[PDB]
Swiss-Prot record, chain B:
Residues annotated as site: Transition state stabilizer: H184
Function: Catalyzes the interconversion of 2-phosphoglycerate and 3-phosphoglyceratea crucial step in glycolysis, by using 2,3-bisphosphoglycerate. Also catalyzes the interconversion of (2R)-2,3-bisphosphoglycerate and (2R)-3-phospho-glyceroyl phosphate.
Gene Ontology process terms (BP): canonical glycolysis; gluconeogenesis
Source species taxonomy: Eukaryota, Metazoa, Chordata, Craniata, Vertebrata
Protein name: Phosphoglycerate mutase 1
SMART domains, alphabetized: PGAM
Modified-residue entries (N6-acetyllysine), positions: K104
Post-translational modification: Acetylation increases catalytic activity. Under glucose restriction SIRT1 levels dramatically increase and it deacetylates the enzyme.
Phosphotyrosine modification, residue list: Y24
Gene: PGAM1
Leading EC class: isomerase
Biological source species: Homo sapiens
């Protein structure tokens, strides 16, 4: 191949379990989520994968997935770059609610609309929201401009703030021939996948990336995939 | 007043701290890992906040940092790794206990090596079990041939650590970044010797405790305002 690139969605989180919308809430991995990451790492190790640089978000579910993979592959010494721009989509006022609470309050017609829409954002997270201070006042976002700090995001917004990091920080590493590992989130990784494969808005919203499973890309000199993405793992986890 | 915190990793596996672990990439033992947890809890209890972290490229230091950041809920922090904060490269002595060192190289050289501030140990011979494990490890592939150590005296170690402190760490402190450094006895010695203006003799007698946060208050010139303080019960 011309360039090798590996992507991985964080393993299952404690809130994925509860079916609670996390978004920018910094939920940790569940024990099952940790094992997923560990197994993904062992799959990367059995295949003899080597990286030169790692990108991740500022969210511990992604960072811990990266740590567990680096540990399994004996590459804890690699440089690791964190950015809010790889964060999960900001779910606004839905943050902290489970799916029952969401349906109860908004009705399933509205949930379906949000679910199937590329560019309609959920309600904004406002100053009386239970997680407002927890997220908006977190010092990790202190350097964001007023315009950059979302009160909510559509998938399109998420992708819009994710791609500039890909373009400016990841692409140059790849073109240098550095072997890149990105440990992040379903929606931030969709931005990358959509961009690589030129997927439609409809198709990307159908793309469901599984937690803790390494995704492998082989790109041409124009960073276009030469073949479709491939999942790494034992034959079972791969099939499913 | 600037706040700087240092932490030295604890016990590594297979008694390797007593076997010139040096540049061999030994992991923490479970006890060494627990030390890091307790160190991290102290930092949590005290409410310490950091803005950036520095560590070596050796997993025992890196795992110490990871354990600390986890404990204080600051896993989102920027982390910078450098060979320049590595332990001393002990060359041919690496992996050997005290008896084996004496038996191999004799009591004469052994005595000199132990008390000397600037006499390097001998480099690994091609039959050393760590020979290719260390010298061909790709984490050092960017090093110039003359940057790539094969064996270091304490002086050599301090001399390649201080440029990193000056060029990379000092500027972060001056802009008010709260720095955490997780590293090794000998690389931390370099930093302490420079901060406190210690002599060769004094630094070789300074044995920094492991697994415990070492706190410095620094003035505008990065000069310590008081003796190093330890956090904990
Ligand atoms: O409600 C949403 C949703 C709402 C607003 C924007 C995007 C989505 C969205 O993308 C989504 C949803 C539900 C489910 N299935 S679920 O009801 O079982 C569900 C799972 C986890 C959290 C909330 C759950 O409800 C999905 O698979 C989705 O991809
Ligand atoms: Cl890291």
């Amino acid at each position: 191949a011309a360039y090798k690139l590996v992507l991985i969605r964080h393993g299952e989180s404690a809130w994925n379990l509860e079916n609670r919308f996390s978004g920018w809430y910094d939920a940790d991995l569940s024990p099952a989520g940790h094992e997923e990451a560990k197994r993904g790492g062992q799959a990367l190790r059995d295949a003899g994968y080597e990286f030169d640089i790692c990108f991740t978000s500022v969210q511990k579910r992604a960072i811990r997935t990266l740590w567990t993979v680096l540990d399994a592959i004996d590459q804890m010494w690699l440089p690791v770059v964190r950015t809010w721009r790889l964060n999960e989509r900001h779910y606004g006022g839905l943050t902290g609610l489970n799916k029952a609470e969401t349906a109860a309050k908004h009705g399933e017609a509205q949930v379906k609309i949000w679910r199937r829409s590329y560019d309609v954002p959920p309600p904004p997270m406002e100053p009386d929201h239970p997680f407002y201070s927890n997220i908006s006042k977190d010092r990790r976002y202190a350097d964001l401009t007023e315009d950059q700090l979302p009160s909510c995001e559509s998938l399109k917004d998420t992708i819009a703030r994710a791609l500039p990091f890909w373009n400016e920080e990841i692409v140059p590493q790849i073109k240098e021939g550095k072997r890149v590992l990105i440990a992040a989130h379903g929606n931030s990784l969709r931005g990358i996948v959509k961009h690589l494969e030129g997927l439609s808005e409809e198709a990307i919203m159908e793309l469901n990336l599984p937690t803790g499973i390494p995704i492998v890309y082989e790109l041409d000199k124009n960073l276009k995939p030469i073949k479709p993405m491939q999942f790494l793992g034992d034959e079972e986890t791969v099939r499913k």
